């Protein structure tokens, strides 16, 4: 058993970007990959998604990728590649839109998508056991602690509040929709 | 500080 292609390619992309951040500085990578911060950048379509590929420290990237590997891994194995692509795109896009609306375009990380995945895997298991996917009891707890640490800013760092709430909402919404 | 997602 191993991570399928979508789980993998997101992990490598995040590592490559993280490397480029270390060599170039975070600011140079943000100039290229951040949500449009000027009207001249509005048609550079990748920017609505690529904010998800940027991480600002070792612990930031590790925690983001650990959850992705587990939850993304589970979605891809049980529901296939296509579904993970769509969940990721929608959560990246929406989480990004809510975050910039709250606090402007300077943000990054995969935690919008992760909060979506947590919401999605959980609610799909609850509403639709015949799907073949669910969030195991123990991880429900650790996921629940993660969400609490987001709501109350317990991570010891500047938080993308809009990305987190929008991400969680989307995962729940997509689960609801798929469970019909 | 940049916001962490």
Numbering used by the authors:
A (entry chain A): 91 to 270
B (entry chain B): 2 to 6
From the paper:
Rhomboid intramembrane proteases are evolutionarily conserved proteins with numerous important biological functions, including growth factor secretion, regulation of mitochondrial dynamics, and membrane protein quality control (Fleig et al., 2012). Rhomboids are serine proteases with a Ser-His catalytic dyad (Wang et al., 2006), and they recognize their transmembrane substrates in a two-tier process. It is assumed that first a portion of the transmembrane domain of the substrate docks into an intramembrane interaction site of rhomboid within the plane of the lipid bilayer, upon which a linear segment of the substrate (possibly generated by local unfolding of the top of the substrate's transmembrane helix) interacts with the water-exposed active site (reviewed in Strisovsky, 2016a, Strisovsky, 2013).
